[PDB]
Every structure is written in structure tokens, then in C-alpha cells.
Design a binder for these strands. Structure first.
Lengths: 242, 106, 28, 331, 120, 387
RNA sequence: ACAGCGCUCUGGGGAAUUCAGGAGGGGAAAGCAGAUGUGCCCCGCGGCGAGACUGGCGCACCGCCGGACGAGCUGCUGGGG
């Protein structure tokens, strides 16, 4: 396929911070690498010889639900370079590394994980990248890292818990600005393993509107993950920023 | 000269760089975030730093030798441009006579 | 009135220093 | 930025005192125009968005200097009706919104405390001190100012409470603990001059908790002994000094500081036949310390600093002068 | 180190019965490396690890990728019983039973992973 | 009705005194939400009253540990005793606002005259602390030493590393960067030794002809001085360099006697000997790196060290990136990193992955598992010898 | 080129510069909800508050609920000196 050594060109995608790398017989998605020359989880990276220190990392959509959503055609993702992002469910920091690279050096990414060994991997990734800070605590109890997390602009949620809506509800009630963007990744098989997927997504969107967001988009990222859906909402407003 | 960050408050660094910077580096040494490393590895780091400083001093005395040698060979080109670029020209031509066979545009 | 700092009692004594100072001021 | 409006309020407050100064013959109309123009420029700069405690301080200095010049002109023209009441009121207003706009500037806080203590507002001074301590807890200088002025007033309980809260907070540098011991022994001295306290056990208690406080070191104990050794004219002062030196012996057996306090221990109340006998005693202790197993370089640097103090004291013998010069030269 | 340890009362036996059913249905993967590859490819619907293996580091490394990819993983304390349930005639320590689009085994998987998500 | 409210932050905690509190009934209104959003309509609600920074990063770590566990710390109790008016709730109480309900309960059981309100249970104190946390960068800036980002960064690293116990068993970065240093200076040594070999054989070619082992070459050229100062067994050196009396020294002296290379200048000989000192210093540092790296390998991943051997095992570790990646890789990807060669290669890859996962997921690993695995490898070697 | 279609018309483009507006981003303590000089003592009212009382209830019996005195300290822009 996209063999190592093929020449591609790199154009900027519509979102602020993601690039699309097109070339030859395969077009793929990439983000600007923050630390050059050192891959995180063995991903392919693209080198550009500017007329060195600039390189891009190829984003695996089958492995990261956010990349799956952006190829699925989200209207927006709310995370411009420089915008603080609270990431819930930061298991081993792959997608978190990508989000930190999108946000860049002036912002921050607050990776909240829970399992200790995935926490060790996340500690390694945060020693490498200087704009992500790691927090190993149970996301159901935000009174633990209320001393660490300031008012972020985006909340990513990648937890599959039956209490997913309540988890994002309390974390947004404590750490999200007025009109605060969030993305949630909903897995129907874990939310209600008996129910059909469209009904599960409708139930979760209604639970979020009870928990005071306003849903603006919902897509079923079907050619990359079965029975998933990415739901984009805004906290306590209708527009995103102000 | 700086040991570990734990040895940074008792460090003497004014012989290598004047302060207004070598106090900011002590500030960063107190409020850094890097992991603690054993002295058993700091020995390796210190020996490597000795090695690279020895390489730099060898480069400096090599450049002094090269300036002396180009002055000895062709004082006209050295008084014109400098021993370094003269050495580059001698390198690209192969020999002093092979360079002298070249015209001005070359 | 949280205007000033009121002198300590045994009810509002936090550390061992304050406890011993009040012990000595009691035994005087 | 409605600063035109806010300045309009403050100048309309300042107007009637200027009407009083115009109906009196104290300032003439050209001077009053100069005054109102300077006050307008000052108030606009003060309420401007980008402001600085230096700007607030310069306006304070100008208003206070105007009060002083008005007092001089009033005493020159022999009037008594014009008071300083409005001037002090507006100065207090400037300082209040000054510490509102910049609460974290100990320069401005100290200037405000200086102004209160100057014009005689003691209750206001205690309130200002309480607010400034609540905003800057880790300020050993502020804690010492509170405790020392309370003890100067005579409120030993209040000076206590200030110092106890202070040493509960500021645990990193021992300066406040030295200051509390200093004030406590000054209270013992005031009682002895007036003539439990018969024991005088509170500095020993401060020492016993300072031993476990995380500043506790040899040099810290040395500072403690220094502030204990000042004003040795007391009753249990030898008891206190002996407890300090025994505690330092029990903790740091061979530290050069401990050897220094063993050197200067019997020189507590010396100034006279009692002086040279203790001098010879400490000289024997000093020679024993110099020949014993101790860090001789650090000990001798402490000793030559101590002898720099001794030679700074005058009215001594030429023979002991020459032998101290020799012993200092052999180091 | 195996904190999602399955308890004695019949949850372990429901797990073993489901494993045997999946082995007959050929919707099952045996072995440490095959579990690792199925989890990496993302076909794994659930994964069970033995807790009485010789040193636990193997069935400790499987939960790392398991937690990275968010699959339900449990520990059953008997590798010989795991082998006798898979029908191997040798001791397995890692079983990843995958998902199809149509069976009743999928319903049994849904009930079982609901129980183990309650366990975690 | 709220009076004071705590707020714990990374640099330290501060308590604000509310003036002109917000309306709790129309709390879900666009006007009050806009007032919470902007700064010029929230500073009228909140006025700063007391601040307390941490004394040291260890103290801030203690703060996070106690606070997240729910227990208040002693200096927080001290600061609240300083700021709150002393009372017991017999006739007049003080309403505080805090975030955690357990902290609220503990502060209530500490001071009887303070009724706390939790942000979990009361929406007004929820919205109030939410506004304060939003505008927190401006309210403290008058006394904020520096900024808040670096403090949050370092404090989060300290807290998470304390919970994980990370630096006790992370050393793979030292291993991989040592390997990269080792082969980098090995290549540099080879190139510099070739350089001085040609650069001195221009003066004396029989030394090139008769002495190999370019490190020993660099030693003997630092030793030899010029071509005119030769004696065989001068002082302490050639017998521990090589054979002395009857093998090579007379051969070198005879090659110098018959030698017809150009005479060299004094400064050129000085430069050559400086380069040779450089080469021998890097070679000595190489053997130092090899010894310390063998010891560190035995401390970190001993099973790989006894199965593969330290250089190739650390090459595999370096190419995977870390021990966690090495263990997460299956056997066949590790293979990517006749028939008997393929058979023993797949078998060796399996045993290598086993050693990797053991030595990574132990805390302080042991050696006998790798010894047992190497014994199995030798027994399979005898099994394939049976053929 | 013909034919057709669309926009636009003090024809149409580029540039300098003056004026009238609009939208978006960043920054800023960006903070006039009731603006009264300081100190003392007295009166009134309110707080802490050591200590001393006392009434009722108490079938898991272990404890609860309530009145009214109070040394000392202290608050007041409540009004008067």
C-alpha cells in the first residue's frame, strides 16, 4: 500500500491543524509532529525537506476514533491550535499524542486516564511532549483533578462506560467554558448491549440534552468502526466560541 | 561542572557563562520536571561530556594549526581572504599548482 | 467581626508551639 | 473605560475644600487652577486601565505633600479653621482603591501602613495589618512589623497571637522565629525593668519546637544563640544559654557552630574585672577548639568574624590587642 | 496484579461454557500470540486469561493492549480447565473470542461482558 | 446565601469573599450566564480576600494527595483559622463554599461555626466557582508569581508519577540512548583511525604493513614519536601492548631502519599525536560504555541479556523503542524486527518475546528464567544436531 | 466568429490616498449595588465566650430536646458627647 519511500505531497485539510497527505495510490491523514524524528507508537511519519525539523505523523483511523470521525466528515472539531482540550479516557496516549500535536505548543492537552500501566505509557508520552499533562485518576471523580484542570475549551470523551453521560456531565459541569465544545465517542455494544444502535445513540443524545449540552452533529463512523457514533455538542450555548 | 539538579544549588558556573542566565538555569534546575537519574548513569553522561569538550578543543587547535599552515604555504591568499576559505579552495582544486592553473572565473 | 486577629484560646490552637505557649501562659 | 466619569466624581468631591481655600486668602486663583489641573491628570492616570503601584504612590506623595504645604501656609498666615480632615480622607480613599487594584504589592502595603502609623490611626492600622497579612502570609517582614508594633503598644497577648500565627505559617526561613524569641526576651526584660516568667521557659519552648521545624540546622541554632546572647542582663539568661548549648552539644557534637558557641558561652554578661577573666577562659576554650578535631577552616572563619566584632569594640589592652592580632594572623 | 479476578460463584463456569461454545462455533482464538493479534486487529469481542500461569507477565502484557483498545478482559484461575474447555488437549492461557454479525453466541457474549463490566 | 468560598489551585489556594451574590432562582437565564462569562460583570460578584501559596513542590504534592483523598491538610486548616471569623454555630454561622463534599464535611467537623456548601449539591456555589475558575488567570495576576501553566504542568507530573511509581522501573531510555552513543562513536572511531592510519603511513608505511588493530596503531603512534627516535623496550609499554623482545619490536625497528617515508615536521607530528590521543580516548570511553551498559542491562532486562546477549538484545530494544513496545509486540512482528534456520528463528523469536514480557512486567526481575530458557535453546540446538 | 447563458452598467481593470460603515480574532483587573476623616469614653443593640445553673423526654438505652445567668474579650454608618 502506502509503502515507505513513496513520495507524497502534503496539503492542509479544512480543519485548523490537520493535514491531508495525498500521493500516488493512497491518500492519508496526518498531523504536524511536535518532537521530530521520534515516533510514539511505531507509526509511519512523513519527512519534508524544507528549502529536517518538520515532519508529520500518519494518523491511523482504525485505531483512533477522532481520526475516524474526521475522515467520516465532521463539520467541525472545535480544537484549533492553542485551545485547551480535556481528554477523558486517555488510554496509552496514542490519540492523545495526536491531539497534543494538533493543539501545539501554546495550548495544552489534559490526558485523564485510569489504568496504571496505560498510565506508565502515558507518563512516557508526556515526558516526551511538553504540552500534554497526564492525570491518572478515575474520571468519575473530578474532585481529584479539580486542582490541576483549568477551564478547557474542548472535552473529548473516549470512555465506554454505562455511566458515560453522567461522567461527561460532571466533568463538563466542573471544567468547561461557556459554550464549550465536546465530542463523545459512543459504542452501542457497551451502552446497551441489547438495544439497536440508532436507538442507543438517540438515548445518549437525549441524556446529554438532559445534562445541559446542545447536540449539533452526530455521525455513524461506519467504514472504520462498527456500531460506533461520534456526537458533537456545545455546552450551554448554540454557537461554539462566543 | 553542574552535577545533577540536586547538586545545582551548590554549583559554580560563572567561569563558563556570566550570570543573568546562569541564575535562570538554577531556577529551572530547582523547578524542572525531569526524572531522577542514578549517579551510575551520570558517570556515563559526565564522561561523554568530557569527550565532546575534548573534541571541541581538538577542533580549535586544529583550526589554529590550519591557519599556521596556510600562512606558511601561500601568504598572499591568506592576506587576501583567510586561511579557512583558502583551505577550501585548495581542497576543491586538489593541489596548489592545480589551483594556480585555474583562471579567475573558475 | 473578622476585622483583626483575636488572641488564641485552647479551642483555636493548631500546633505544638501554640499548645506549649498556652500551657506556659496557663501555668504562670 | 468610563474614567472620565469616575474622575468627575472624585474631582467633584475635592471641589468644596478648594472653595474654602479660595474664600480664605490661602491660595490664589492661578494656584487653584494649577491644583485642579494636576489633580485631574492624577485621577485620570490612577483610574486608567494600565496602572502601577508607583503611579498610586506618586499620587499619594503629591496629595500628602499638598497637605503639608497647606499646613505650612496656614501656620504662616495664622489661621486655625482649615483642618487636614478632608485631605486625610481622600488619601485614605486613594490607598484603599490602590490596594484594591494591586493587592499583591508589599511596597504599596508598607507605604499604606507607614501612612497609618504616621497619622495616628491605630485601630485602622490593625485592620490594615490584618488584611495585608491575609493577602501576604509568607512575609516575615510583615509579621515582624505586626508583632513588634503590638508589643510596642503593650498588647503582649495580641503581639503573641500575631507571632504564633506567623510561625505557624512561615516555616521555611527562621527569621520570624528569631524575631519571636527576640520579642519574648524583650518582654522578659520589660518585666525585669518593671520590678512562669520566674522560669522564663517560653524561649526554651520555642527552641524545643524549632528543633523539629524543617528549618532546623546548625547555622539556625547559631542565629538562635546570637539573638539569645544579646542583652544578657537577665535572671535566667544563663539557664537559657546553657540549655541552648547543651542541646547543640547533644545534636551536633562536632559542628564548628557548636564549637563557636562553646567558645563564646561564658561571655554573656561581660563588658571591669569580670571581663578579662572570662576573656582568658574563652581564650583557653578557643585554643582547645583550634587544636581539637573540627573543621578548622570554617571554625576559624567564624572566629575571625567574631574577633572582627571584638576589635570593633574599643577600650582594650594593648597586650591582648597584640595577642588577638597574632591569633587572627595565624589563621 | 490481576485485579479483575473472576469470583468463584458460577461466573467462572459461565465463562468456561461460553468459551467451549465459541470453540465449537469456530469464533474463538487460542494462545497468547493469537489473542494479541486478534486484539490488535480489533476482532476481539472478549478475552479471558488464566491466573495460574507460570510467571504472570504474559497474561499481564495482554491487558495492556486490551486496555488500550478497550476490550473486556477477565482472569479465570485455571489454565488446565481453560484448555479442557477450549478443547485443545494442551494448556492454553489466553483466549480471545471474537464477534460475528449473526449468532446467539453474540447474545451470550453480550450478557457475559455486561457481567464482567459490572465486575470491573 | 454564601459568604466566603475556598478555591484550590495549582500554585496555591485562595478564598474569596462574595459581595452582591448571584440570584439562585433565575440561574438558568441568558443574562446571568452572560454576566458569569464576562469579566467586567464577575469582579463585582467576587472580591479577593486571602491567598496561600505552597512553600515547596513537595508540599504541593502533599496537598494534591491529601485533597484528592478528601482529607484536609493542616496548613489549610491553619489558613482557614486565620481567615474565617472565630465562631461556633450557636447563634451566628459563616457560610463557606467548597467543591468536594467530603472536604465540606471535614471542614465542618473541624470548625463548628462554618457551614459549608458543596459544589456537588448546590448550583449557586457551582456556578460561582465555575466563574472563578474561568477567570482565575486574571483575579490572581496581581500577586501571581509567573504564570499557572508551568505550575500545572509540573504539579500534574509530580502527582501522577507519585501515584504510578514510575522512575523506579523506567530505564529503557538510558539503554537505547547508550546504544546509539555506542555505535555512533564506534563508527567515528573507525573513521578517525583510518584517517590517522593513512595520515601517518604517508610518513611510514611499514607500520601499516606490519601492525593491524587500529586502536593498537593509535597507541603505538602516540608512543613512537618520530621515525628517528626508536629503541625496542624503552619503558613499561611494549610488553603489555604486545609481545616485546622477539616478535614485533625488532621487526618495527628494522622496518624503520629500512624505511623510506618522508620526514615529518614537528607541528605536523604534534597534530598527528593529538589525533591519536583523541582516538585512544574515544576507544577507552567505548570500553567504559560497554562495561557500564552490560551492568545496566543486567539490572534492567536480564532474561534478554542471557538469551540474546547484551549488544544484539539492546539493538532489538533500541529498534522497538522501549520495553513496553517490545513486550506489546507479538512474536512474528519481533521476527520482522534451508528450513532449520527459519524453524530456529521462529522458535528464538518466541522465546525472545517471552523474555521481554517477563523482564518488563516484573518489578525487579530475576535471572533464572532466562537461564532456563537458554537451557531450552541449547537443548533444541542438540535436537537439531540430532539430524 | 454565430447562437445561447449569467453578472453588471455616471463602461471595465491595477495602484496610491481621503472618508463613511460592517464582521471576526487577540489583548486589558477590564472591578462607581449605594462613595461620609481620625482617636477616646459613655448610652443602646449584637456577637464570641471561660464558668456556673435548671426543666422536660428517654420499653434497642446509648442519650436527646429546651429555658436563663454569666467573668473576660469584641462589633456597630444606631444616635448623642
Amino acid at each position: 500500500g502506502a509503502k515507505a519511500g513513496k513520495k507524497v505531497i502534503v496539503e492542509p485539510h479544512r480543519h485548523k491543524g490537520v493535514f491531508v497527505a495525498r500521493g500516488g495510490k493512497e491518500d492519508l491523514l496526518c498531523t504536524a509532529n511536535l518532537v521530530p524524528g521520534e515516533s510514539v507508537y511505531g507509526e509511519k511519519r512523513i519527512s519534508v525537506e524544507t528549502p529536517t525539523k518538520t515532519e508529520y505523523r500518519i494518523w491511523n483511523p482504525f485505531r483512533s476514533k477522532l481520526a475516524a470521525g474526521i475522515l467520516g466528515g465532521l463539520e467541525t472539531i472545535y480544537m484549533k491550535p492553542g485551545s485547551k482540550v480535556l481528554y477523558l479516557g486517555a488510554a496509552s496516549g496514542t490519540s492523545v499524542s495526536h491531539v497534543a500535536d494538533i493543539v501545539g505548543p501554546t495550548g495544552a492537552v489534559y490526558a485523564v486516564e485510569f489504568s496504571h500501566r496505560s498510565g506508565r505509557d502515558l507518563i512516557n508520552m508526556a515526558t516526551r511532549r511538553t504540552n500534554v499533562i497526564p492525570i491518572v485518576e478515575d474520571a468519575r471523580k473530578p474532585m481529584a483533578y479539580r486542582m490541576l484542570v483549568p477551564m478547557v475549551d474542548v472535552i473529548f470523551a473516549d470512555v465506554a462506560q454505562p455511566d458515560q453521560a453522567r461522567i461527561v456531565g460532571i466533568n463538563a459541569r466542573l471544567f468547561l467554558k461557556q459554550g464549550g465544545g465536546l465530542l463523545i465517542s459512543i459504542k452501542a455494544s457497551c451502552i446497551d448491549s441489547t438495544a439497536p444502535p440508532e436507538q442507543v445513540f438517540a438515548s445518549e443524545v437525549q441524556k446529554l440534552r438532559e445534562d445541559k449540552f446542545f447536540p449539533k452533529e452526530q455521525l455513524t463512523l461506519e467504514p472504520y468502526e462498527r456500531d460506533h457514533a461520534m456526537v458533537s455538542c456545545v455546552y450551554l450555548q448554540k454557537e461554539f466560541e462566543g | 561542572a553542574l552535577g545533577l539538579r540536586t547538586n545545582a544549588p551548590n554549583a559554580d558556573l560563572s567561569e563558563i557563562l556570566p550570570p543573568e542566565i546562569e541564575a535562570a538555569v538554577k531556577a529551572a534546575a530547582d523547578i524542572s520536571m525531569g526524572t531522577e537519574i542514578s549517579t551510575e548513569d551520570y558517570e556515563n553522561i559526565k564522561l561523554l561530556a568530557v569527550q565532546v569538550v575534548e573534541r571541541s578543543e581538538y577542533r580549535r587547535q586544529l583550526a589554529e594549526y590550519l591557519q599556521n599552515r596556510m600562512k606558511a604555504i601561500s601568504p598572499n591568499m591568506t592576506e587576501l581572504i583567510g586561511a579557512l576559505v583558502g583551505a577550501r579552495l585548495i581542497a576543491h582544486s586538489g593541489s596548489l599548482v592545480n589551483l594556480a592553473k585555474n583562471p579567475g572565473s573558475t | 467581626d473578622a476585622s483583626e486577629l483575636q488572641p488564641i484560646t485552647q479551642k483555636t490552637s493548631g500546633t505544638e508551639l501554640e499548645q506549649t505557649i498556652l500551657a506556659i501562659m496557663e501555668e504562670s | 473605560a468610563w474614567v472620565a466619569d469616575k474622575a468627575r466624581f472624585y474631582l467633584e468631591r475635592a471641589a468644596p475644600e478648594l472653595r474654602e481655600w479660595e474664600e480664605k486668602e490661602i491660595f490664589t486663583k492661578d494656584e487653584i487652577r494649577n491644583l485642579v489641573a494636576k489633580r485631574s491628570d492624577f485621577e485620570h492616570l490612577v483610574l486608567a486601565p494600565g496602572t502601577k503601584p508607583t503611579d498610586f504612590l506618586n499620587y499619594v506623595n503629591w496629595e500628602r505633600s499638598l497637605d503639608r504645604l497647606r499646613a505650612k501656609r496656614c501656620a504662616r498666615l495664622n489661621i486655625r479653621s482649615v483642618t487636614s480632615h478632608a485631605s486625610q480622607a481622600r488619601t485614605f480613599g486613594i490607598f484603599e482603591r490602590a490596594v484594591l487594584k494591586h493587592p499583591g504589592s508589599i511596597e504599596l502595603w508598607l507605604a499604606y501602613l507607614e501612612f497609618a502609623a504616621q497619622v495616628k490611626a491605630t485601630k485602622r492600622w490593625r485592620r490594615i495589618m490584618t488584611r495585608a497579612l491575609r493577602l501576604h502570609p509568607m512575609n516575615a517582614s510583615l509579621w515582624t512589623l505586626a508583632g513588634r508594633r503590638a508589643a510596642q503598644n503593650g498588647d503582649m497577648q495580641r503581639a503573641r497571637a500575631h507571632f504564633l500565627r506567623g510561625c505557624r505559617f512561615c516555616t521555611r526561613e527562621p527569621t520570624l522565629w528569631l524575631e519571636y524569641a527576640r520579642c519574648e526576651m524583650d518582654w522578659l526584660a520589660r518585666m525585669e525593668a518593671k520590678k512562669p516568667a520566674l522560669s522564663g521557659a517560653i524561649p526554651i519552648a520555642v527552641f524545643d519546637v524549632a528543633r523539629k521545624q524543617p528549618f532546623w540546622g546548625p547555622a539556625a541554632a547559631e542565629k538562635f544563640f546570637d539573638v539569645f546572647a544579646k542583652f544578657g542582663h537577665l535572671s535566667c539568661h544563663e539557664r537559657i544559654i546553657s540549655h541552648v548549648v547543651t542541646t547543640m552539644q547533644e545534636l551536633f557534637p562536632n559542628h564548628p557552630c557548636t564549637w563557636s558557641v562553646h567558645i563564646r558561652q561564658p561571655l554573656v554578661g561581660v563588658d571591669t574585672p569580670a571581663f578579662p577573666k572570662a576573656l582568658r577562659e574563652s581564650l583557653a576554650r578557643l585554643k582547645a577548639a583550634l587544636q581539637s578535631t573540627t573543621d578548622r577552616k570554617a571554625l576559624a572563619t567564624k572566629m575571625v568574624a567574631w574577633m572582627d566584632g571584638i576589635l570593633a569594640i574599643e577600650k582594650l589592652d594593648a597586650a591582648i590587642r597584640t595577642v588577638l592580632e597574632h591569633t587572627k594572623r595565624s589563621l | 496484579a490481576a485485579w479483575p479476578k473472576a469470583e468463584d460463584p458460577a461466573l467462572v463456569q459461565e465463562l468456561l461454557d461460553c468459551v467451549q461454545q465459541a470453540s465449537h462455533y469456530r469464533q474463538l482464538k487460542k494462545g497468547a500470540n493469537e489473542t494479541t493479534k486478534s486484539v490488535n486487529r480489533g476482532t476481539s469481542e472478549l478475552v479471558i486469561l488464566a491466573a495460574d500461569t507460570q510467571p504472570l507477565s504474559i497474561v499481564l502484557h495482554i491487558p495492556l493492549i486490551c486496555e488500550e483498545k478497550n476490550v473486556p478482559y477477565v482472569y479465570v484461575p485455571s489454565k488446565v480447565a481453560l484448555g479442557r474447555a477450549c478443547g485443545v488437549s494442551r494448556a492454553v492461557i489466553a483466549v480471545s473470542l471474537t464477534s460475528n454479525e449473526a449468532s446467539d453466541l453474540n447474545s451470550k457474549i453480550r450478557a457475559l461482558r455486561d457481567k464482567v463490566e459490572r465486575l470491573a | 446565601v454564601v459568604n466566603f468560598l475556598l478555591f484550590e489551585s495549582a500554585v496555591g489556594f485562595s478564598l474569596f469573599e462574595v459581595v452582591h451574590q448571584a440570584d439562585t432562582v433565575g440561574l438558568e437565564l441568558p443574562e446571568v450566564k452572560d454576566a458569569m462569562k464576562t469579566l467586567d460583570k464577575f469582579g463585582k460578584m467576587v472580591k479577593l480576600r486571602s491567598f496561600n501559596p505552597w512553600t515547596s513542590a513537595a508540599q504541593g504534592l502533599e496537598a494534591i494527595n491529601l485533597i484528592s483523598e478528601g482529607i484536609m491538610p493542616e496548613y489549610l486548616k491553619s489558613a482557614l483559622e486565620m481567615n474565617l471569623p472565630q465562631t461556633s454555630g450557636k447563634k451566628s454561622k459563616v457560610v463557606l463554599g467548597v467543591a468536594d463534599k467530603k472536604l465540606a464535611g471535614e471542614i465542618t467537623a473541624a470548625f463548628p461555626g462554618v457551614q459549608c456548601e458543596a459544589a456537588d449539591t448546590s448550583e449557586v456555589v457551582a456556578a460561582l466557582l465555575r466563574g472563578i475558575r474561568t477567570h482565575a488567570n486574571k483575579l490572581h495576576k496581581s500577586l501571581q508569581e509567573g504564570d499557572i501553566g508551568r505550575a500545572q504542568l509540573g504539579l500534574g507530573h509530580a502527582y501522577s508519577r507519585a501515584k504510578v511509581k514510575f522512575s523506579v522501573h523506567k530505564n529503557d531510555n538510558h539503554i537505547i540512548q547508550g546504544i546509539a552513543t555506542l555505535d555512533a562513536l564506534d563508527k567515528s572511531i573507525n573513521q578517525g583511525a583510518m584517517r590517522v592510519r593513512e595520515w601517518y603511513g604517508w610518513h611510514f608505511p611499514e607500520l601499516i604493513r606490519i601492525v593491524s588493530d587500529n586502536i593498537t596503531y593509535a597507541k603505538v603512534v602516540l608512543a613512537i614519536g618520530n621515525k628517528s627516535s626508536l629503541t625496542d623496550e624503552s619503558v613499561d609499554d611494549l610488553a603489555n601492548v604486545l609481545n616485546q623482545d622477539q616478535d614485533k619490536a625488532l621487526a618495527i625497528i628494522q622496518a624503520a631502519k629500512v624505511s623510506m617515508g618522508q620526514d615529518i615536521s614537528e607541528v605536523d607530528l604534534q597534530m598527528v599525536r593529538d589525533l591519536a590521543s583523541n582516538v585512544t580516548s574515544m576507544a577507552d570511553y567505548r570500553r567504559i560504555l560497554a562495561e557500564s551498559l552490560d551492568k545496566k542491562m543486567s539490572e534492567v532486562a536480564p532474561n534478554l541479556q542471557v538469551i540474546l546477549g547484551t549488544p544484539v538484545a539492546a539493538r532489538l530494544i533500541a529498534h522497538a523503542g522501549s520495553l513496553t513496545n517490545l513486550a506489546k509486540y507479538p512474536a512474528s512482528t519481533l521476527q520482522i524486527l534451508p528450513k532449520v534456520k527459519g524453524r530456529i528463528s521462529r522458535y528464538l523469536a518466541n522465546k525472545c518475546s517471552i523474555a521481554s514480557r517477563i523482564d518488563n512486567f516484573s518489578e525487579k526481575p530475576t535471572r533464572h528464567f532466562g537461564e532456563v530458557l537458554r537451557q531450552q535453546l541449547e537443548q533444541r540446538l542438540e535436537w537439531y544436531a540430532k539430524g
